C-alpha cells in the first residue's frame, strides 16, 4: 500500500 | 529512460483542488517528475499533481 504525504506537494 | 508518466495501478490520491486524480489502470502524461514524492502532470486535459508514489511511470 503505497503511502503518500502531501506535505511534499512541488514546492 | 526518462519517466514521465502516471499510470494508476489504485484510486487516485488527489484529495487537493491543484490536484489531479486518476483510476485504476490509468495512463497519465506527466509534465514534471522533478520532486521527491509529488510531481505535476495531467491527465488527458485535466492538470494536476499526483502522488509518484501511489502510481509508476509508463516507459513507452
Known amino acids: 500500500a503505497p503511502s503518500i504525504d502531501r506535505s511534499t506537494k512541488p514546492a | ?60
Open chain 2, 1 to 60: 529512460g526518462r519517466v514521465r508518466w502516471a499510470r494508476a495501478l489504485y484510486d487516485f490520491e488527489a484529495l487537493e483542488e491543484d490536484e489531479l486524480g486518476f483510476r485504476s489502470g490509468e495512463v497519465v502524461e506527466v509534465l514534471d517528475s522533478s520532486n521527491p514524492s509529488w510531481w505535476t502532470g495531467r491527465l488527458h486535459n485535466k492538470l494536476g499533481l499526483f502522488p509518484a508514489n501511489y502510481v509508476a511511470p509508463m516507459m513507452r
